[PDB]
Amino acid sequence: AVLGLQGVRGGVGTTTITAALAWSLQMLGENVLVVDACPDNLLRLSFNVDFTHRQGWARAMLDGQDWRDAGLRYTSQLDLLPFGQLSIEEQENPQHWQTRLSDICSGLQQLKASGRYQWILIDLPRDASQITHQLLSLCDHSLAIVNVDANCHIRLHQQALPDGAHILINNFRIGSQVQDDIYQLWLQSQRRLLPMLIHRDEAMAECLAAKQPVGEYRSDALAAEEILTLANWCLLNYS
Amino acid sequence: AVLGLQGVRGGVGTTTITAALAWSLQMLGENVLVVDACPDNLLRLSFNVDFTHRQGWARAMLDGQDWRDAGLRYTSQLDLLPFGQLSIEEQENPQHWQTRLSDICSGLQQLKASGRYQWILIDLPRDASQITHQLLSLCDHSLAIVNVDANCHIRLHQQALPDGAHILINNFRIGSQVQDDIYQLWLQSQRRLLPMLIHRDEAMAECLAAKQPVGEYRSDALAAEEILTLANWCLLNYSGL
Amino acid sequence: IFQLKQAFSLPDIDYADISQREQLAAALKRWPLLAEFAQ
Amino acid sequence: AFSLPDIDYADIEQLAAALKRWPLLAEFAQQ
Numbered sequence A: 001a002v003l004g005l006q007g008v009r010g011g012v013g014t015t016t017i018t019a020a021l022a023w024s025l026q027m028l029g030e031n032v033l034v035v036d037a038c039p040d041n042l043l044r045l046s047f048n049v050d051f052t053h054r055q056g057w058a059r060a061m062l063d064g065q066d067w068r069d070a071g072l073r074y075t076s077q078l079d080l081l082p083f084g085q086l087s088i089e090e091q092e093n094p095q096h097w098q099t100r101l102s103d104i105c106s107g108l109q110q111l112k113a114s115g116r117y118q119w120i121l122i123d124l125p126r127d128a129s130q131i132t133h134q135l136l137s138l139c140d141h142s143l144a145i146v147n148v149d150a151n152c153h154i155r156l157h158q159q160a161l162p163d164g165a166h167i168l169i170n171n172f173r174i175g176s177q178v179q180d181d182i183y184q185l186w187l188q189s190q191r192r193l194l195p196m197l198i199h200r201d202e203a204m205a206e207c208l209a210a211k212q213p214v215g216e217y218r219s220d221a222l223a224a225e226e227i228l229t230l231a232n233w234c235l236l237n238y239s
Numbered sequence B: 001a002v003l004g005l006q007g008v009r010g011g012v013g014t015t016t017i018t019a020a021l022a023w024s025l026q027m028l029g030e031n032v033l034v035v036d037a038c039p040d041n042l043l044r045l046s047f048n049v050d051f052t053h054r055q056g057w058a059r060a061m062l063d064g065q066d067w068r069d070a071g072l073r074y075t076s077q078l079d080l081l082p083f084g085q086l087s088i089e090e091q092e093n094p095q096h097w098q099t100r101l102s103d104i105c106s107g108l109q110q111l112k113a114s115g116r117y118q119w120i121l122i123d124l125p126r127d128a129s130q131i132t133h134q135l136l137s138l139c140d141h142s143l144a145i146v147n148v149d150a151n152c153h154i155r156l157h158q159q160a161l162p163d164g165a166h167i168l169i170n171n172f173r174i175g176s177q178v179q180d181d182i183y184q185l186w187l188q189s190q191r192r193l194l195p196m197l198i199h200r201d202e203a204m205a206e207c208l209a210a211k212q213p214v215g216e217y218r219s220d221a222l223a224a225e226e227i228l229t230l231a232n233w234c235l236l237n238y239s240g241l
Numbered sequence C: 001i002f003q004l005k006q007a008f009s010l011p012d013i014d015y016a017d018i019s020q021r022e023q024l025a026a027a028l029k030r031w032p033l034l035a036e037f038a039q
Numbered sequence D: 001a002f003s004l005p006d007i008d009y010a011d012i013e014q015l016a017a018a019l020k021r022w023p024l025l026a027e028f029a030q031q
């Protein structure tokens, strides 16, 4: 199954959850490929990839090379395909390359048809570029990552999500009355809300600094257990 | 003075700080215009603008109308220029309209020259579109807003900020060991860090739900006092053109 | 509808059963933003 | 006018314990 993870806004924890969900699927005995579709190229850093390692699927395409030679093996069950490092000029001119990357959809379509992986997780950026909509079309299911706050609450009433997307709460915290009011409102009104959420957790803040997925960094962390619950739900509902 | 505010990433508190800072500046006696350059069109909601109100400077331009009539007055010293509501079709086609909005720069460069406002604050989105870079060129100064975490730590080492920008920490809170390590590292290595930060504060989370800036919502909150310190810093340091 | 074809829709939100829970009535009372979308 | 932020790790100050604690942080410091 091809699963897209995309934040309803930036910074809600999409990348950390993607790496963690991939680790949990492996722990459940699954073969997983993780693809970084974000030009920030941060997913690789949850997998001990050196910051100076610039290779990636988009870096390869723009250099006229085979994107299939830019993948990395993390474990025997978990492969990683970083986006690649863009130069400052490329970062500040997305219109130069956001249309040159259409071959990745064909390439991921072949990979999907081969059944080489049981799961392909795509970390998708918060934009509406051509390449982002193209990768979303390959997904069989999608998760919309939110935080429970007034910002996300407004966005759910005005911006479109992928069809059939389910909403996943991250960063649930103690000490916020307004968050609890919004959350209780969501429990009665948001039809596509997932029955489990992820709390704010020190392990989720440290695992990126240790360059590991949270399940590998602290297997008994509460957030690691919450992600494992999500992985079990995906096995049952997103197969 | 034209001040741009931009998050180093999304969701760091850029819009809330903009609305709060504009309230503190008009509190200090300045005539302020606040402009939402984010297609999310969220800044208006901190000033009790109805959600059904679709009018905005971008919405007007795309509908062949005058953008100057899309303004709203909050107080006698604080005016609001919402972006306007984009249809779902427009949202998923950014290239269609991100190129037709270049005229707002001349309309703002004229307003900057007239001097009707002492401060023009622009809430800038986290992208690299043409209109975003154009508005950034109109700014006299800029603030790059971050949260103390590993994500922002990486971004500060690989992505470009507006030249001459200062870094402003938001949502800070002592307790997390890794965040304190990052914070101590930033104090000794980030040359352009601002001497004041904004702590996490439930008033900052509630004010948007009350559709007010944090200073009007709860003037004695710690974050409101911190925004006032920032407003005094801009008057002393960001006044020149 | 992006053209494989990927369609985009607003999140499925239903506010019909709000008035049941009294705790939701107090939350809508305090936060005008939530009451604005609810009614 | 876009450039990278001004950062100097010239001399590193109990940050040595932080750099040994977090490989991500030591990566940018030694670089």
Ligand SMILES: Nc1ncnc2c1ncn2[C@@H]1O[C@H](COP(=O)(O)OP(=O)(O)OP(=O)(O)O)[C@@H](O)[C@H]1O
Binding pocket: A007, A009, A010, A011, A012, A013, A014, A015, A016, A017, A038, A040, A042, A170, A171, A172, A198, A199, A200, A201, A202, A204, A205, A206, A208, A223, B009, B010, B149, B150, B151, B152
């Ligand atoms: N549940 C959590 N508890 C604590 N820290 C978290 C949690 N989720 C994410 N973080 C931290 O928040 C920061 C942002 O997370 P992450 O990079 O996964 O988000 P994102 O939505 O992918 O951001 P971006 O817009 O840059 O892509 C990181 O430093 C991460 O370690």
Ligand SMILES: Nc1ncnc2c1ncn2[C@@H]1O[C@H](COP(=O)(O)OP(=O)(O)OP(=O)(O)O)[C@@H](O)[C@H]1O
Binding pocket: A009, A010, A149, A150, A151, A152, B007, B009, B010, B011, B012, B013, B014, B015, B016, B017, B038, B040, B170, B171, B172, B198, B199, B200, B201, B202, B204, B205, B206, B208, B223
């Ligand atoms: N200092 C703070 N303490 C607590 N909550 C905060 C703080 N700053 C912002 N928030 C909350 O975080 C959420 C995001 O804030 P905001 O909308 O200002 O961020 P942003 O960077 O403009 O987001 P976006 O990427 O959507 O434009 C809001 O619910 C806001 O109330």
Ligand SMILES: [Mg+2]
Binding pocket: A014, A015, A016, A038, A042
């Ligand atoms: Mg991300």
Ligand SMILES: [Mg+2]
Binding pocket: B014, B015, B016, B038, B042, B123
């Ligand atoms: Mg904003």
